[PDB]
């Protein structure tokens, strides 16, 4: 069945593909990372550092890529994006992740 | 796999029989996507990931005192809501 709260792993999404000079967003297909983690506050007063907070993340990448349409005179039209092999609950990695809290639905074009 | 419902625990260690010390502990949900082009033009440091959560946290706690000494606080309600950090 469909487990409700369904551990971090790759789903199938559509990455919305832009690049400046170029006229029209491609939104592309591929999967992305998305479910549930296991976390918990320390209720212990006191500790340190802080116990941080594991996050759904990417375990594994490969990369494709695709020509936007209508690009100009010598832009490069062939933009990369990321496809999740895997999935994994970890660490969100500030120096690599721009982590932070729900958005409304952000990989549409725009 | 399911993961287990962000909800109060029975924190084992800290609860004494009639007085259990209760602990928010479950699953939230969390995604990580490309970060937007929109995104990269916002950002000083370009991350290549953004990754979008809610971790199991109180929606309310009690300071309390236990056992001697530990100085402790029980979970009265629970949510998904921020990770901070
Ligand atoms: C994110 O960036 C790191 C470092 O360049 C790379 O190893 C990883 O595969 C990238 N992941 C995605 C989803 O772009
Ligand atoms: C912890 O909170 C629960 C619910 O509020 C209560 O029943 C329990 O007795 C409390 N324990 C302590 C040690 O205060």
Known sequence: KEPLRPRCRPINA???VEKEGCPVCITVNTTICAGYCPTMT???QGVLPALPQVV???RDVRFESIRLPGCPRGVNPVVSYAVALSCQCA???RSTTDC???KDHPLTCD | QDCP???L???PFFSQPGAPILQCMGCCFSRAYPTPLRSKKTMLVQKNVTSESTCCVAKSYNRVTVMGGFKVENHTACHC???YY
Do not use: D, I, M
Request: glycine content about 8%; charged content about 15%; aromatic content about 4%.
């Open chain 2, 81 to 83: 809501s921020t990770c």
């Open chain 2, 5 to 7: 419902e962000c909800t």
């Open chain 1, 56 to 58: 759904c993340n990417y």
């Open chain 2, 9 to 11: 625990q029975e924190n």
């Open chain 1, 14 to 16: 559509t990455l919305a």
């Open chain 1, 42 to 44: 320390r209720v212990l």
């Open chain 1, 100 to 102: 932070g809290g729900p």
């Open chain 1, 91 to 93: 660490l969100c990695r």
